Design a protein around this ligand. Sequence first.
Ligand code: HDD
Ligand code: HEM
Lengths: 726, 726
Amino acid sequence: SLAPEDGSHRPAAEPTPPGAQPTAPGSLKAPDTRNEKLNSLEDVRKGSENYALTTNQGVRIADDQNSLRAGSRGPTLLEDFILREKITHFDHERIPERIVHARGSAAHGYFQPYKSLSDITKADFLSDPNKITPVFVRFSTVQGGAGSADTVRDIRGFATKFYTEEGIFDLVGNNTPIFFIQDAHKFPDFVHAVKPEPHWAIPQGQAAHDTFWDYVSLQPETLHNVMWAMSDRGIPRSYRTMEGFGIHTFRLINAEGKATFVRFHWKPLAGKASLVWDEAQKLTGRDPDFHRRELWEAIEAGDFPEYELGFQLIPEEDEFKFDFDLLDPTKLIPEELVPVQRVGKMVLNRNPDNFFAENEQAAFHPGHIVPGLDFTNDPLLQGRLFSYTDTQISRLGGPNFHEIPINRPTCPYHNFQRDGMHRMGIDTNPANYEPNSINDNWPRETPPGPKRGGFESYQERVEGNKVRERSPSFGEYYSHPRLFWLSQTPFEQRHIVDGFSFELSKVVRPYIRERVVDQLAHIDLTLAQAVAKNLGIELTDDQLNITPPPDVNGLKKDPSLSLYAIPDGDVKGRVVAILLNDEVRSADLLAILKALKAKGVHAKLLYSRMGEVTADDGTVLPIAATFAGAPSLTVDAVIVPCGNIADIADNGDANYYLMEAYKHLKPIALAGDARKFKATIKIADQGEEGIVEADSADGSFMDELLTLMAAHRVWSRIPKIDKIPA
Amino acid sequence: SLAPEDGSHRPAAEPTPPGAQPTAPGSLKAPDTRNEKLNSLEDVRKGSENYALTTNQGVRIADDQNSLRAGSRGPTLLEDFILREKITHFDHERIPERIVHARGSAAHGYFQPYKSLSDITKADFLSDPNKITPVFVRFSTVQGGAGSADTVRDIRGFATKFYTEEGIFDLVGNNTPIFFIQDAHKFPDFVHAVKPEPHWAIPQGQAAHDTFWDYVSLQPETLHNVMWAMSDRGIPRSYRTMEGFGIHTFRLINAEGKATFVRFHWKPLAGKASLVWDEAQKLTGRDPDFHRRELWEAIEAGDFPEYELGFQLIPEEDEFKFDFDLLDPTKLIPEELVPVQRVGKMVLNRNPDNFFAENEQAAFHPGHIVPGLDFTNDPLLQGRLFSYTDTQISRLGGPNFHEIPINRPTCPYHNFQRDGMHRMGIDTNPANYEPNSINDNWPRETPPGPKRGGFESYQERVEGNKVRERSPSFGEYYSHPRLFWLSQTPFEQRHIVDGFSFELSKVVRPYIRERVVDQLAHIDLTLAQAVAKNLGIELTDDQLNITPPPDVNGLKKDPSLSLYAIPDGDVKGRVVAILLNDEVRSADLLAILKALKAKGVHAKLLYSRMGEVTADDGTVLPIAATFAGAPSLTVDAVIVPCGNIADIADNGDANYYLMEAYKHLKPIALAGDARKFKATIKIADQGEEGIVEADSADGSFMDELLTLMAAHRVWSRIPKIDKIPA
Ligand code: HDD
Ligand code: HEM
């Protein structure tokens, strides 16, 4: 037997903190976590233990180590069907990746509404607070391939498949409340401009190249979502710590037939948090799978991603009441004008079993709505409805992608559609058409009605000529980017400046940089000037005299647009690095771990080598990673306990660990003789807001560190970090 | 008309150094670089300037900014065929990536032999020194997807398609002279074990995870290629500075019918050069396209990648004269025992026009041989012959992938094969079968012969029973790894130890680390002890007493197995960072730039912002990048000229630039007051080997720095770097 006798190959089927056990398929890690969708997949889950190895035809294999040959040094024979089946399968493993959002990470979970919403919608999944709907969610980046890195600067996708009793509803959103373009006709142009350039296929996962900024400089409608992407919104800390938005205005339809306009929101119950650029870009090198890993391990730990679904509702009579068009997906609806009403809660509580079968093959599409919902004439949403059914014909091999197990509805589905590649369902209906008498016309149409009704489109009035023309109301491009700019804290504004400065410095053709800075002068001169100075461009007198755009219905700022202006911090699920030494003061470690445990914060024990170290009281401490192997980039704060500090005080990696954490605005805590590390990062003996220090690690020490962590980063340190060489 | 009036949007069609001009399609950058294959591609090359925008049916488009709707705020109409053609084409842009070596970078070039090899092979392309054969080469990594990073630790692929007058020959090799496994039947197991794990699809581009080292610990045949991947061979500086190997013993067949065993080699004329791990890993975040970029720009600069083809030749009578089986792809043939005979030169001198069309769709397959070459019974080679035709059926959409332009032969091809998806050729033969009388049996078979004859397999004798059995002669696993280890310099050995140590520290299940350390103890006790000490593992007395494996045919070392033991340095094509200040000594900068230009070394002028700076004498100096924008990871050396040093002396990024270059063993040269930076890297007054310092950049300053650049890195600095926090 190849397993170790102690059973240490196999993870415990209980929640455990990140790193404590090897990760495992969901159904093995959490066998008792169920929901109607998870259960329904049992027909296709395949075990392995105690079973014979076979071909795909069920023939047991005696020797899976050798090809069939004529003599043991002889040629391989064509009659080796075992070799050829295995190699043929392998040779055809790959399927086309998604045209956009190819890089993504997913989990199973459930949603339920807080109260019935039957006064505004007849959608069944929102009709009953005690009716649970399983979900499957995929989070993604946009530009890079399926093997690109997670912590790039990009917009993030947040797609939710709701397996309702009246059909699948897919809410296919992003983490910013607008898109870059107005009309779907332009999507291939925009996507080609952001994607790797076609001659050399560079750069991966980066908008920082000429063709993207060329498109931006020529299409000012892009500027709003570009401001979002250049802010710290572009580099979330975790999929758990970003917002979601459906972007488009949709309709809700109630049983009386009344339509209300709606925009959809997800509020992360873990709070909003992002990285800083230098950290994000280095993390794509040190751990290109960091968000994928963090999501999977939060779920294994019981730190389940939770989000609150929220609706901005606007009555039909108020369609034209703002100074922007509701159907323009480059405009946001400020929550100061239309509040987000809380609707329900979604909990992600199980990882998939096989990433390819469940994540790679999942198909989401915003056209998959249910009775009680409907579309609007938003010209971006209108073209998305064509694309998501079409692309699955090549990506998933044919028109039967709904029979791939992750995509299957859990409610009944019956119709007269037949055949297609890899057809699974065997229809027994004598009829494959309707109307028919030979099956008494089953399956039959259902009239629309208050519940369990057929889908009917809201009878919106259409009046105009057949035209390819952009609505004049869409031709305003600068006021929303300006509202966003003015809503950010001063440090968030600095990071926006630095985002544009860094990206445009990688554009080789200087005139493109100049044209972008001229667009910025149409938004805000302080922003335009700060970017120009980093690019060595001087604004012209004319540019300095551009009139700022109008306020948005009187608003000079809306703090809900900022990540940080209103505290919402939650430490549960975060992780602290603990830098060990070979004689750790076990009293410090007791106090540190007790306080972390009470707040659901995880620890990773690091040292200069792997294996174990023994603390002052004999406690054996297994080492999670070396200082170089698990860099500060990967944690939220660093604690250095007392002990034999001499052991690590001259270690370059341990000093660098602190210098990188300090540069990246993370809280650092130093107990006892670990305070000698203050010399490495400057710090007055008097101390610094953001560095916790004391004779020992105790109640008070841990309290201060935990309070720092609830504020996420130490923004006050920003002016101290330009001078530090790290 | 949106182009700048000055014409600065368009790169000059002449060779230009990296970063001087935007990069461009090959045929626009270097229109006069031609070869027979590049010329034959003219029938499918499509221009653009001065043409009307059309659908794919040739219909001019009036408004490519808008969908057709009913009213300019109304719904989009199904009758918009222009939108639907455009979005349908976008929706189906992606094809499946290659199952392995999905990440790769390619160029066109040509091959010519030094002399006729008619005495040993009747292969037409090797028959005449004046015969030029166009090639297309793709270099790749092995594990990561097409969107993964370039400078991972991995084996690299080096695949060459020779478009010969007697058919396509594809030499599909790697950058190490052996493979991980012995029998193709194991290829899916090995590849599954190294690829991202199947529950969560982590990690991308890394073998540093449990399932890879699990397989290694259980399959000792893997140890030899694992030693090479853990060495600095696994992290090449460039595709131009690595070796290539076809790995398998093949046969050469001459016109008298004599077979000679042959292994193929490519020697890089630029010399052998690798990164160090920290630098490689960080570079996968700061520039995940570093090797792709470097290859493209070398070619644009005229620094053409050049390689020398070499053969190791073994007479048929000497098949059994070595300690290892010639057919075993885990064994190398030491150059001390069988020298590489130089055969010809390949020069890559033009980039593709379109990466998808030429790179992504190119199909190489080692079964594509020509008369004059033949296979052996190597059991890994034998299974490869099945896989590369099979996998193109899905990857490239059918059996007509040879009609995709890049894959087309330039010589005649005619046969009786018909139809298949995407069939381009319209056959006019009345017959689609042979023998036929209705076309007088054309096209006709051709007897074998000395030139232009049909392919016949060498009549090797086969004798044996039909078995799935590994030859006993393959059952030796440790001697070649030990020969590799003993052949390395001491700094190379240290890097091997650090490689294994880093990788195994990422293995979560400790018993696997233990089992690998046990395997290392079978190779070399010094290596096993040093890895064990880094993992906190103590060898047992049994392990300490394992007797070493025997020498390889009497060899205790072979220096051709080392990257660095025999100096082969070439600076041309390398790049230096020049860290500017706001009043540079122009005399220094004149001396520096001209000395670099004389040796073909490129420079990049860096500063704290973009735009220009003005030298002491008023010379305006354009800035290529900021210190953070183009990190030291991306250059071979760093020069800091004299001037107003206090301008950058306090700049964290400028100091960190030097500390990083220092840690990564790069030469650093400091002129005049730049010597103030010696305190940053802790250099003594009397200086140290590997730091060039003088009062000015004149006399021997540049000659010294170039002498350092020729030795690639300052290995003697390794003891001095462990203490620096960088
Ligand atoms: C039985 C399967 C099998 C085995 C044992 C190997 N390969 Fe392979 N290799 C493939 C099956 C395969 C493949 C699946 O057919 C690929 C992927 C897509 C393609 O066109 O070929 C491939 C791709 C591939 C590429 C990329 C070619 C390109 O750029 O398109 C290179 C350089 C190699 N291989 C080199 C090797 C070497 C040097 C091997 C051992 C000596 C080796 N392969 C063993
Ligand atoms: C409103 C801004 C947009 C948002 C928030 C959006 C959202 C998304 C998301 C989240 C995914 C990933 C779903 C998954 O996890 O698999 C996706 C995939 C896709 N999107 Fe949209 N998208 C938008 C604009 C568009 C437009 C306008 C089009 C068409 C013109 C489009 C065509 C596609 C295609 C082809 C895919 C790949 C789907 C698959 O292969 O299954 N995207 N988009």
